[PDB]
Structures are given as structure tokens and as C-alpha cells.
Subunit: 393 residues, 4 copies
């Protein structure tokens, strides 16, 4: 263990600051001061802090209040050395955003939400953030006839392209990252998975500066393989930021510590972030952000306990993931299974679809029954990863 | 009821021909002859029939067997008037495809699978099919370390772009449609949802002729809103074909009749296919294909019963969906809820991000607390759709 | 369809009183005065109202306040004629209840919780309720080492048997109804399904007055069939109360209007409540209670609309379900599928095990392959049901 | 970690004998000779073998054939010393069983099924098994009107009580173990979870010799916590046998190696099997049986590897789980979180309901807000568990 600032562990203000109100109860913790949040995070080993506009500045704050709050906030950053790598907007708590922000059926709410985002783009740039996250938590419905589904996507595109266009126009060194979620708070959220988010960016005018912010728990709420999904984001060159946490199953968004959900998936998530791909390719080099919530049953000792535990978890998995790939029996197990063979092109250099046209050598004289005997040995390969994870090897 | 060929009800050979072997048992029905399948379908009102290569021609058939089978097959088509709108390949039953076709770790299997597809592209063109479907049922894994996830997508791209390139090269009037599935038979299938499939096409060299073939049951196995997902496919101009069936929940692929799963979702699926969008936009005009399986407990009377029931179900939902949108109280309910208001651009013609920059009129002097009082009346709107569906209105 | 007090539709105070606060946002509606809840529901057709101690009487209420409130509420009830058939305790909203009431790790909290329940049994008795519901929403854990699981069930048992002992002792006409929920707010809730609730009752010293209160959306949060789950409850004669609502898949507890979730499942629950079992058996006679939440997007006109939609939905389903069983065609199809043959005992009167093994016709010379030919025609009976549901018959 | 017969690892014949046929494909492995299964497992460390009547003796086997096979199998057993601790019946693969065995709609099938079970009780008794498992995989429906649900449970009861009657009558040392499964092959299976299995047993005339056989992946197919579900089974003293495997979410029954699914859940099951309850209580003493399937991608070297991986996984988890509870730090954290306080009865010796309501300290003057301040520190106890699991402690 022992996290240091080069690890790039970033935490949201709303994570440690989450006081415990869930849908069946009131907060169980006293509010956490932001200056206090910054000091504690810096002392634990964090590299940066992120926030939602209304996490720092009340929705109601006056210009005088806004400047007082930013001054103490900015002094704390200064005193500690924490960076502010990502900033986001709250388009979900105020009753006004009850049918959404960008895709609200009410046109005046659409403008209001877009206006709130544009101003937040100015604060992001002022803080030195490199990523602007968008979580469209109220964009969706409970009922299928509540929306014109083509119009909802046109309205989503207008919002995202106006904000991008504005970044480009002002020359901020900022990228937008959309954060998919399948449901909750809405019955169905638009762009519910990594796939949907990625396809959607391809339809934008300014897609070049738009990417994703996948969250472990969120793909797991649809039953999807998180490593598979980030792999696809990474492969497309659109993995701009990431939110790490735990989810045990398809149920409400739990936001547990990273590693306190699906442990084997978390191991393979850390191998992809740290080690990248077996055959070489793209690498994710941004910050490792923890979007979780300290369990409501625990007091403030639990809150600082949970923040350290996320970092701990990631460094213990990282250590076993480095030893796993380094292991000569694993490397040989991988060669047997065809992990490196998958890296070879199917077609020979210069071969055409008519040339191969299945060639036979690859079609007519192929022994399918003999090729089928191959022992891929995937089970033995999986056993090697579990033993490495368990600290056994 | 009373389906007629202008309805464009197409059925797969494997649907009525499915004999009942599941994972816990043997077939409960005698094999169904293809010529017999064509006569029965034509007499029930179908417009066309689709098949997988090995549905008609055994994997082992000789050239002499292949031409005998196509001759009787082609005569039946002739005798009845059925079209052959879609053709697909079996890259999943033979033991050789145990780690996949296009993304097999074994390079020689990759070539073999690609060769089988290329030849099948020639048969598709020969049958007059306009769509070539690809269901990558064995592309995936049980274990996360079994594959190099960037390489698996590169290998998937190579296969799809070689087949497209070949279509283009031969001038066939054919489009490729990928069919997403989240799991089963693999623990995790690559391109598991509509979103993933749509993003993936954006990375291809020949994406222009590649689109999707969403299946009701398959998005519902991830817990997703099927209407939401096809809306997104339609909005992107990539809804090339569709597979309609029933699924009750997240479990194994049931392939029940259309309407025998999530009934309210099926109603809204039929409103989108038939009515399109409230404010106007794109429309799906291809065939309505039924990819289901007659319950194993039923004999052949059940098989012809189930085929008619799919058509019946779609025409009863169609009828209630036309009456629902035509209803002046529904139209007024929609106007109250802001369904048409969602269709208006957020920004005024000529307004810039700095102009609006939230304007206030839309930011600073906005009454958020007053805009929040609005009664969207989505519940009353949902009640109007259920009453129309129930035949009450 | 107009509900009458005779229909026995009950509503909770917390249902139409739900203010809109969820985990991602604040209330969107003003608090509801209890007096008005009562009067409004009385004009809609309700038979009665139900409450949680703290929905009516604030946690911190002084004695003068409590008497006032009860005077006001008892007044409204006398004015309108509304019955109060069920009363329940709030053991989940105050921070003290973060680890549970009955199964909290802290013993003083366990005692407070039980004291809190006993006093509420007195109130329930004063109010004329017949049923006392226990929903243990905070009983469970997020993590597997947090609880000694055998001790969690002894503690659960000790509180439920103490409550029941007290009823018996006091001579009150109250029966306890346990209400299962698999998750939310806890990660895992003790006694998560109807099955676990029924099992637990059998280990109770006073299980004769302890039964179930199954909720539609709760069983669907684990993907079970609600109609099968309440059928087991009935069969064991333990179906004391029922909570009707709607859920649209495995996710957060939506609490949508009855019939606004899984529609065909809603139709079959109503057929079971209304027609009982095809071969005869016990019948459910209690209140038809709705525990739903008016979507937060809707203002007060939506609240009364939603309340009304519950009773409308139920009556429309009832009309269809009665027409379904009354149909000669449906009866014939039920005979053919063996719905009535299931009711015939398998053995012959006084036929023992030995006699069966020894009957040659039954085993040794049974023609398995011939028997397997029966066409159960379950698809066609299902189609008939849906056709009645859609009112096309 | 080397398994010894003392470990009591049992395997089914159908497990390592699984040939690879799934719903989308044919077998990828040759059939396994039973003699070799037995010898191979004996050399790996197995304690015993288990089978389904038809895994060993073909459905259609003549008497000479059956005797031969039994002679061969009994030979191998004498040679190796393998015990046969559990025997079960195949009521799901032949087409006659399409609607179930015990709850088939057809009465002659119900009789055949019961005859088939009785004869298998004789064999089981001859083989020395202590447990007779019933997995009712075809008992259920795809559609809600297919069954009279109260009659489905009477028929279920009649077959299980007849089987148990027969055991008692014959003086056999056999106990019946019911095995739940929520779905697959049927859309909905009767008695879907541990909870429903335990509830049903209580309605049986001979429920004293009828208990449960929970399977890890089965409880996870409904998203329940396996460790909670077997804890209820134990608490009721009804945990007669257990099936260990792995499942990676809500989907088809994967039957992966124990520990190859949800890893932290596997660790806590092992802690419960090995350490029992923190405060004491009953302990599970039967066989540790694995009901898994070697992935079809793997040849025979993979089959024995997978068999071995099950015992390895279990022993490695056991080592960690024992080190976990033996740790002073872990014991201290368990004390602080109230794991031992849960074991203290809530009331005082001879304290009644009345006395509790009346104790002022407990209710009237209880300081709720003070009590709510306790830091349960469940996150830190969870972190300690994972750290032991990862062998970093
Ligand atoms: Mn989240
Ligand atoms: Mn997030
Ligand atoms: Mn399917
Ligand atoms: Mn399909
Ligand atoms: Mn609920
Ligand atoms: Mn309820
Ligand atoms: Mn299984
Ligand atoms: Mn099993």
C-alpha cells in the first residue's frame, strides 16, 4: 500500500461528503466542510478532488457567497497541492430537473439546464480541470409514451454540441465525458450503457472532444462485463475518465468501495488499466477516480476508512496483477490458450476476400473435426489468475 | 387479424423447425421438412422465409446434395411466392466454433469462419436477400483473461469489413445487420447490446453498408428498454432488420411469441414501427421477422398455432396502437405532457452559446421554483395507453 | 368501472402522501394533510386507509400534539366512513435504525424498536385494524461479515414472537403479516422473498397468527413470478394481506401503479384473487391494498389520477379475467392442456408406494415414447388469455 | 493444498462427464466411461461420486445391460474405495418429462415419474448413499395459465411424501434433499429459492426426513446471497447437502468451478461451512459436492484440471477463512461492530412484553439521537475480510 500523488487517485466531494440520506431514511452524518475535505484527502495520499457545482456552491448562493466559498476553496487547494482534474454539474437534485435537464419536455427548463452547464464550463476552465463530466441522471422516463424518443436524442445532441462548440470557441483545454447509467433515478435513462454512449458521440458535430466516463456499478446494473465495456471504450480511443466503485448485483446503485463488489472483475479492471492489452495497443493514462459512498451505518472514522480502503484495494489488486502477468507459467498458459494468436491478422498480407474466398487450406479441404479437438485450456488459465489474486502464487 | 403478404411477416426456418432440444433435454418434435415449412408459411399469410446456411444444407452435404436441396427449395419458393429477404450463417453449432468464428483464438478457425461467410454471401445474393445477418453467438468468453479484448475487436472488424468489401466488390444489393446478445451461449458476448453494436459499426472501413438486427429478448436479457434501444438504432439510420419475440425477464433466451413476454413494451414497440415518432422523423419500413421458438411441451398443432399467434399479436397490437394515437383525448394528453414541446429546438434560430450563455430570461432571472410546479401528467398519459391496449377506450 | 367501498381498495397515507424525495433529489410536492388524504380517497371510492405510526404522528411529537393529530384523523374517518384495516411501524427512517430495528447489532436499539412496535400494536387495536404489518427494510447487511446470521434470525424471531405474545395476552383481533423485500435500502435484506417469509413463520412459537404481506414489485426485484409466490402463500393459508403496485424489471423499487409494470402478470394475479384456483382451494378475502408512489414528475392532479388509475386498472383486469374463465373456448383449452387433470391425485385410493412400483402399466410396461406425443397446447391457452386481456374477445 | 478423502469432496458423474452440448451446439467431447471417471477422481483426491439413474444406466437399457454396468461400476468403487453418498433421478431429459415428472398435467406421466423415483430409492439404498436429491427442473410453466398452482403443490407433495413414506417403510438410511432453481429449463420453476423449498417441507406429512440441497449458482440466478440462504437452511436444521459451483450474474445456469463466479461470496460460504456462526449454532457436516460443468472449449486435460480447480479453490479459501477468524485484529473489529452483541437476547430473563413497554429507559426516555451516533465500522470489518482473502495479511 501507501498511495502517493503519482498514483492519480482523485475523489469526488460528494463521495466522502455523502451524509446518508437514501430513499428509506435521513442522513446519518453531519455535513462535511469542503476545506476540511481537501485537507483530509491530501493527507491520505489523493492527487486531486472533483465536485459538482452545487457540491461547493449552493443553488441559491449569491455572487458574494460564491466568491467567499471559492476563496476558501482555492486557498485549501493551494495549502495542500490538490489538483481539480474534473468538474461536473448537478442537473438532478432541484425539483426543476424532475423530467431532465437537456431532454426536459419543458423548453424553458432545457435552456435553464444548458445555461447552468455553460457557466460551469467557465468554472471548470478556471479550476484547471481537463475533463468536464456529464451524468444525465434525469434524462429518461418511467413510461414509454412520455417522450418522443427521436426528439429526446436530438435535444441531447443540441445540449452536448452547444457545450463542446463553446469549449472550442473559448479555447478551454477541456474534453466532455458522458456517464452512462441504465436506470435510477428514472425507470429508463437515455444512453444507458457504454455502447449507447459511444454510438451517440458518433452522431455529434463536435464528437472529437466528447468521450466517456464509464462507472463500474453502472454497467453491472445491466449485468454487463465492465472490463469488456471499458476495453471497447479504450479500443475506440474514447476512455477519457473512469469511475471505480463496487456493486454486488443488479439492484439499486450501491457505490461501495472499489473491490467490495465483484472482486474478480475488479482484478481484471486493474490489469487493463495498469497492464493494458496482452498483444499491445492503447493504454488509459488518466486519473483513477473513486465514485463511491461510505456506508450509512458508519460514522466519520468509517468515512476516512473508506477513502483509504479504495486506494488500498486498487494498490493490492495492482500488485497481484503485475505479478500475474510477469509469471512465466501464466505467459505459457496464455500462449497455449491462443491469447497472442488472436493478435495475428486472419488474412495473410496482401490476401483478398476472393484470394482467401475461403482458400482450402481454409474452406473446402479444411478438417473442421480435427481443428475442434484443440484444448483452449481457458479453465486452467482462469485458475492461474484466481491463485495470483488470492496471493497463493 | 388476417395477415396478408403486404404486412411483411417473415419467419426463420429454425423457428418452426426448432425440435425442442434445450440444455436439459432431447427434442420433442420430429424434424420439419423445408419444402413443408415453405408451404405451411405461405398458406398462413407470411411474406417470406429466412434461414441459416446449415438450416437448409447440412454442414457435411456434398455438392450433389447441395444442388438437390436448393432445387426442391427453389421450386417451393416458386410454387408459393415466398421471398427470401434475409439469409444468415451458422457460426455456433459445430464444435469447431467453440471459441467463436471471427474472434476464435485459433487463426485457422478464423479463416475457416470467414470462408464460410463469404460463400454464404454468394448464396444470399443468389436468393435475392437484401439483408445478410451476423449473430456472433460464440464470440466472447466465460473468463476475463481468455482474450486480448483489443485484439478480439480488431479480429471482429477484419471479418465484418472483409465481408462488406466483398459485397461492394461483387455489387450484390446486400447490407450486413449485426445481432447483439449480451450472453448465452458464452458467459459474455462481444457487442452485447444495441449501443455496443452501433458504436462498433462506426470504427469500420465499410460501415455504410453495416447496420443492426436488434432482437426484443436480447436487449431484455440486459434489462434494457427495447423501444428506447430501437429508437436509437432508428435515429442513427441503422435499423436494417428486426427480430420480434417475447422474453419474461433476465434469464435464458426464451424466444416466446411476440407479445407473450413484456406486453406493454411490445405495444410501444408496435407503435414505433407502425406510427414512428410523435413529432415526425425516420420510419422503419423493412420486414417484421419473428425470431421465436415454439414451446417444447406442444406438438406440431402448437407449432402452426405459434406462427399464426405471432402475426395475430402484432395485428391486434397494431390496431390498438393506431386507435391510441388517433384518439383526441390522447393527443391532448400528449400536448399537456410536452411530447410535442420536446420537438422544439432549445436554442432560438441564430442564438449562440454566448447569446443564450444562459440568457436570463433563461439563467440569472429564471424562476426555477415556479418552473418546478408543472404537472407533466405522465401517469395520466400512461393510463390512456394501457386503456387503449386493454381495448377499454 | 367505478370503485365502491365493496371492492375493498385500501391505500396507505405514505402512498398519495409521497412528497417526491428520492436518493438523487428533493421532494417536488408539498406535504399532504392527513385529513385531506382521508376525504379525497373517500370521494374516489376507497374502502380504507393505512399508515405507518410516523406518517401520522411525528417521531418527536409531544403528547398534546399526538392527541390533536389523532382527534383530527379520527374526525375525518367518522365524517367519511373510512375503515383503517392495517397499521405498520416505521423502523427505517430515523438514523437510530441504520442497522435495523429487530436485528440491529446494538441491543438498546433492538429494545427501543420492540417497545416502539408494542405501543403501535395498542394504537392499531384502538384504530380497528385487523392486520399489523412488519416490513423489516433495515434488517440485513451490505457486507457478508457484518452479521452473525443465525443470531440475526433468533433476534428477528424474538421480536416477532414477543409482538404476537402481547397480541394474544391483550386479546386483540390482530394478525401479523410479514413483508418480504430482497434488497433496498440494505444490500441484502433478511427473509427476502415469500418463500423465506413462509419458512421463518414455521420456526415461531406463535406462528398461527403470523402470515404474509407480499408486494408485487418486491417479488419482481428478484425476478420471481408474483402469481406463483402468492399461490404458495394461499396454499399454506398464510396470505393475510397483499400490496399491489407495478415494477418494470430488476432494479430499484419503483412502486408504480398496479398494472403499470408487468401487465400479463397483473392479469394473472387478478385472475387468482378473483377466480381462485381452477380446481378449487382457498380464496383470498382481504383488502386489495396499493403501496405505490405517484411519479415525482406529477403535481397533485396526478396524485389523485394515480390513486384512481390503481382502482381502474384492477377493475378493468377483473372484468377481463371473469370474461376469460366464463368463455367456453377457454374452458375447453384448459381441459385439453390438463389444467383439470392436475387436480386428480396421482395414486388411486388406498394405493401404496409398493402397489405403484409393482403396477406394470405404470412403470415396467409404460409406453414413455407414446406418452410424450401429447400436444399440451399451452401456447394456444396463453394466446386465448392475452386475447381476452386485450379485449379482442 | 492437496485434497484428501477426509475433505469429503464429492463430484457427480454428469459433471466431469458433461460432453459439451448446450442449446446452441453439439458436444465437443467424447462420452466418459464411468469406470474411468471413478478411477480418475480417486487419483485426484475425491471422497466420492454421485449420479443420476440415467447417467449410469441408459433409459432403455435391458436387464442384462443394467447388471453389466452395475458390475463394472461396483468393481471400480471396490478398487478405489470411493463412497456413493448421494443418488438422484433424471426426471427432465426424456420427452415424456416435458411438462414435469411429479407435476406434469398428464396423470399417467406423474405415475411413471413416481415409479421411476421409487425404484431409484432402492438403488440408492443398495449403493450406500445417505442422501436422495430431488431437482424438479421440469416442474413449472412458461405461461401463467398452464397450471392450477394449488394443484401443482398438492401433486408435488403427494410425490415427495410417497417417496419418504416408502423410505420409512423399508427402513432405509436415506434423507431427501430438495434442490431449488428459479428458472431454466422452464420459464418459472416451482419452489424457486431456498426459502420456497423450506416453506414447502413444513406442509409435508413426512417433512422430518425432507431437507434442502441448495446450489450456489441457483440462488445467484435470482440475485440472492447464497451465504444468507444457506444460513436460514442451517438455522432451521435443514441443510442436508450442498452443491458448490460458480455463477457470474443473473443469466443461464453457468455451472462454473466453485470460486470462478462471485469470489467474495465463495469466501463467506466457506467461512460458514468451516467456522460455523460467530456466536455458535449448528454446523454443516455433509459432503462438499461440486455440480459444475468443465467449459466446452476445453478438452479432457481441462476436465481433470477443472475437477482439481474445485478442490484447490475450496482449500485455498478455507486456509484464508481460518486465518481471518484466528486474527486478533479481525476479532476486535467483530466486537466493535456488534457481531457478538447480536447474540445477546433482546429481553432480560423473564422480562415480558408489558415489562419492556413500561421500562422507561428502553422507550420513553431512550435517547434515539445519541444511540444513532454509533460508528458500526462495517466497511473496515469488510476491508479486513478482503485483505485476508487476497492474502495480504
Ligand atoms: Mn453510481
Ligand atoms: Mn459516477
Ligand atoms: Mn434469441
Ligand atoms: Mn435472433
Ligand atoms: Mn416497494
Ligand atoms: Mn409494501
Ligand atoms: Mn446449476
Ligand atoms: Mn445441482
Amino acid at each position: 500500500v501507501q498511495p502517493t500523488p503519482a498514483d492519480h487517485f482523485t475523489f469526488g466531494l460528494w463521495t466522502v461528503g455523502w451524509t446518508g440520506a437514501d430513499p428509506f431514511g435521513v442522513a446519518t452524518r453531519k455535513n462535511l466542510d469542503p476545506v476540511e475535505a481537501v485537507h483530509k484527502l491530501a493527507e491520505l495520499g489523493a492527487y486531486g478532488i472533483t465536485f459538482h457545482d452545487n457540491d461547493l456552491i449552493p443553488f441559491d448562493a449569491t455572487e458574494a457567497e460564491r466568491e467567499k466559498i471559492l476563496g476558501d476553496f482555492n486557498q485549501a487547494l493551494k495549502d495542500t497541492g490538490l489538483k481539480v482534474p474534473m468538474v461536473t454539474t448537478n442537473l438532478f437534485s432541484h425539483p426543476v430537473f424532475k423530467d431532465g435537464g437537456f431532454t426536459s419536455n419543458d423548453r424553458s427548463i432545457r435552456r435553464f439546464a444548458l445555461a447552468k452547464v455553460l457557466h460551469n464550463i467557465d468554472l471548470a476552465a478556471e479550476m484547471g480541470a481537463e475533463t468536464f463530466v456529464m451524468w444525465g441522471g434525469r434524462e429518461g422516463s418511467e413510461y414509454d409514451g412520455s417522450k418522443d424518443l427521436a426528439a429526446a436524442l436530438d435535444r441531447m445532441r443540441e445540449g452536448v454540441d452547444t457545450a463542446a462548440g463553446y469549449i472550442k470557441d473559448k479555447g478551454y483545454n477541456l474534453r466532455i465525458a458522458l456517464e452512462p447509467k441504465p436506470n435510477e433515478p428514472r425507470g429508463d435513462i437515455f444512453l444507458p450503457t457504454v455502447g449507447h454512449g459511444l454510438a451517440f458521440i458518433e452522431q455529434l458535430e463536435h464528437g472529437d472532444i466528447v468521450g466517456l466516463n464509464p462507472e463500474t456499478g453502472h454497467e453491472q446494473m445491466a449485468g454487463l462485463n465492465f472490463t469488456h465495456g471499458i476495453a471497447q471504450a479504450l479500443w475506440a480511443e474514447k476512455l477519457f475518465h473512469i469511475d471505480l466503485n463496487g456493486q454486488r448485483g443488479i439492484k439499486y446503485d450501491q457505490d461501495l468501495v472499489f473491490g467490495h463488489g465483484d472482486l474478480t472483475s475488479a482484478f481484471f479492471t486493474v490489469d487493463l488499466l495498469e497492464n493494458g492489452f496482452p498483444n499491445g495497443g492503447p493504454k488509459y493514462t488518466g486519473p483513477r477516480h473513486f465514485d463511491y459512498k461510505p456506508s450509512r451505518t458508519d460514522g466519520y472514522d468509517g468515512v476516512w476508512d473508506s477513502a483509504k480502503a479504495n486506494m488500498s484495494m486498487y494498490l493490492l489488486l495492482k500488485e497481484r496483477a503485475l505479478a500475474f502477468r510477469a509469471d512465466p507459467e501464466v505467459q505459457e498458459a496464455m500462449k497455449t490458450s491462443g491469447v497472442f494468436e488472436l493478435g495475428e491478422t486472419t488474412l495473410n498480407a496482401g490476401e483478398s476476400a476472393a484470394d482467401l474466398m475461403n482458400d482450402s487450406a481454409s474452406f473446402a479441404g479444411f478438417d473442421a473435426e480435427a481443428a475442434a479437438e484443440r484444448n483452449f485450456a481457458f479453465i486452467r488459465l482462469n485458475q492461474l489468475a484466481i491463485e495470483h489474486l488470492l496471493g497463493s502464487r
